[PDB]
């Protein structure tokens, strides 16, 4: 149904478990044979979808850097992509029944790579990209590589050497992330200086 539709490769057991507290904002069932709420899911999704269709645009002949500020919320994270300002963004959802996530997946040439958040039981990462630009998938893939490097590093440090593991792992991949997220070169420098200070 609505979940396998946007997240084909999802674990089978997911639907055996019962709705967590976040799911319940949008559904009501014993398991994950639950009803979609008419107002909170169906009607919210349709409203958000209209909003997205209005803002939808095609990609420029070429992208310009956005400010990090335009993509610091989940909503701006995908808005900058659907309006064609940049080829990819990444955000999180506390429920695979998030109405925005479902609306996002119904836009032309808009793809979402979805997977469970590392070290979290309910959170999923969403990587949203322009399929109508060759940079879309490339950047989405490149993010997953950088993301895997970060989490591999942090897991290892967590295991054997935990001090400042998060900030250390940022020093390793943060500039590369900034670039693929299209942040302005100045904002990326400023972030590396913030990480450096954390030393
Ligand atoms: C936390 S992810 C958030 C992604 C955001 N929702 C998007 O779609 O662009 C942004 C990552 O980019 C890196 N980064 C580089 N420059 C940054 C900056 N100026 N502000 C925030 N993150 C920056 C950090 O590693 C950070 O984890």
DSSP, residue by residue, the chain:
-HHHHH-TT--GGGGTSPP-TTGGGTEE-S----EEPIIIIIIHHHHHHHHHHHH--PPPSS--PBPGGGGSSHHHHHHHHHTTS-SEEEEEES-TT-HHHHHHTTSTTEEEEEEE-TT-SS-EEEEEEETTSHHHHHHHHHHHHHHHHHHHHHHHHHHH--TTHHHHHHHHHHHHHHHHTTB-HHHHHHHHHHHHHH-
Residue 66: how many other CB atoms lie within 10 Å: 18
How far away, in angstroms, is 178 Cα from ligand 1 center?
A: 6
Locate the ligand 1 atom nearest the alpha carbon of residue 89 and give its number. 8
CA distance linking residue 66 with residue 182, whole number of Å: 6
Say how many domains are in the chain: 1
How far away, in angstroms, is 157 Cα from ligand 1 center?
A: 21
CA distance linking residue 139 with residue 179, whole number of Å: 10
Instruction: Provide the sign of the torsion angle of the four alpha carbons 142, 147, 148, 150, taken in this order.
Output: positive
How far away, in angstroms, is 11 Cα from ligand 1 center?
A: 28
Q: Which domain holds residue 138?
A: 1-199
User: Is the CB of residue 102 less than 8 Å from the CB of residue 45?
Assistant: yes
Bridge partners, 124 (sequence order): 93, 116
How long, in residues, is the chain? 199
Locate the ligand 1 atom nearest the alpha carbon of residue 170 and give its number. 25
User: Is the CB of residue 122 less than 8 Å from the CB of residue 95?
Assistant: yes
Bridge partners, 112 (sequence order): 128
Crossing angle (nearest 10°) for helices 44-55 and 74-82: 50
Residue 11 gets the label, from left (phi > 0), alpha (psi -120 to 50) or beta, of beta
* Residue to substitute in 67, 68, 74 for testing ligand 1 pocket (most ligand atoms within 8 angstroms of CB): 68
CA distance linking residue 101 with residue 124, whole number of Å: 11
Establish whether 155 is an annotated binding residue. Answer: no
CA distance linking residue 24 with residue 134, whole number of Å: 38
Angstrom resolution of this structure: 2.3
Instruction: Provide the sign of the torsion angle of the four alpha carbons 176, 182, 183, 189, taken in this order.
Output: positive
Establish whether 183 is an annotated binding residue. Answer: yes
Contacts of 169 (CB under 8 A, 6+ apart): 149, 150, 153, 154, 157
Residues with CB under 6 A from ligand 1: 68, 71, 77, 89-91, 170, 174, 177-178, 181, 183, 187-188, 191
């Amino acid at each position: 149904h609505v979940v396998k539709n946007i997240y084909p490769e999802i674990k089978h057991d997911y639907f055996n478990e019962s709705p967590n507290i976040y799911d319940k904002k949008y559904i009501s069932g014993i398991t994950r044979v639950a009803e979609l709420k008419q107002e909170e899911f169906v009607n919210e999704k349709a409203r958000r979808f209209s909003y997205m269709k209005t803002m939808y645009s095609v990609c420029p002949e070429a992208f310009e850097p956005i400010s990090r500020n335009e993509a610091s919320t989940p909503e701006g994270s995908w808005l900058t992509v659907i309006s064609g300002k940049r080829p990819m963004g990444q955000f999180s959802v506390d429920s695979l029944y998030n109405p925005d996530l479902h609306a996002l997946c119904e836009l032309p040439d808009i793809c979402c790579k979805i997977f469970p958040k590392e070290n979290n039981d309910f959170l999923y990462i969403v990587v949203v990209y322009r399929n109508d630009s060759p940079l879309g998938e490339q950047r989405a893939n490149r993010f997953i590589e950088l993301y895997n490097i970060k989490r591999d590093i942090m897991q290892e440090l967590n295991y054997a050497l935990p001090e400042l593991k998060a900030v250390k792992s940022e020093m390793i991949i943060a500039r590369e992330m900034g670039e693929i997220f299209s942040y302005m070169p100045g904002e990326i420098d400023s972030y590396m200086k913030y990480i450096n200070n954390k030393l």
